[PDB]
Structure prediction request, 252 residues.
Amino acid sequence: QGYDVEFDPPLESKYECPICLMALREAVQTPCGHRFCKACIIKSIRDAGHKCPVDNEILLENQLFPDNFAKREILSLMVKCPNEGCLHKMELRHLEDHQAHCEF
Amino acid sequence: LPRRIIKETQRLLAEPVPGIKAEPDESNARYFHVVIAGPQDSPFEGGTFKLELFLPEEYPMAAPKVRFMTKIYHPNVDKLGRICLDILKDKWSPALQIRTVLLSIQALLSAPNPDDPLANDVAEQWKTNEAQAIETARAWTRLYAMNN
Ligand SMILES: [Zn+2]
Ligand SMILES: [Zn+2]
Ligand SMILES: [Zn+2]
Prediction:
């Protein structure tokens, strides 16, 4: 459930969620230093067990903490419109005003 | 189809694992037709080995299912084509990917793991008759993995 849009330049792996393979949405980090979309890691914890999927370290829900720094950076990355026709690119946080703010 | 699967598929086709051909089925995108070249210097050299890989509905929370179709003389592959690979059984993680499995199977062909509690009459033959077992894997390669 991460950000499914193409970044420019390509999304650095550091900001790629290892679960959904999309840009971290509401990024959270673990005590072991790994990052995930909040919803993805919660799901992984519930369906795959209480462990960090990257290194298998024990992981509890109460140990997940917000990574507002990564969140801030991701939201400032340049993205492109999800459909041929438009050529404009904008910071991810400004895509909304360019999602349904067009014709069809 | 889950976005992650689409992305993995696109990336596997764009940048394929050397020596490995892997494509989704035209009728089912969760079904992959796989082909692995026998590792250079290994007793399987010169051979082409076919496998089928299936992405269960729980993927990536559940490991992909893989069946070795081509007959091969290897300790970690049974007659039913089942592959004994840790990341396909106990060590799977949603962080692992199809590429990981493919690369891991390719490595298994180069470094057989006869440390199995049975693996049929192939595991012990590989340890207590390695020279013969290897020559047998070689013969099976020419007999079953050379097309024709
Ligand atoms: Zn970790
Ligand atoms: Zn995610
Ligand atoms: Zn546009």
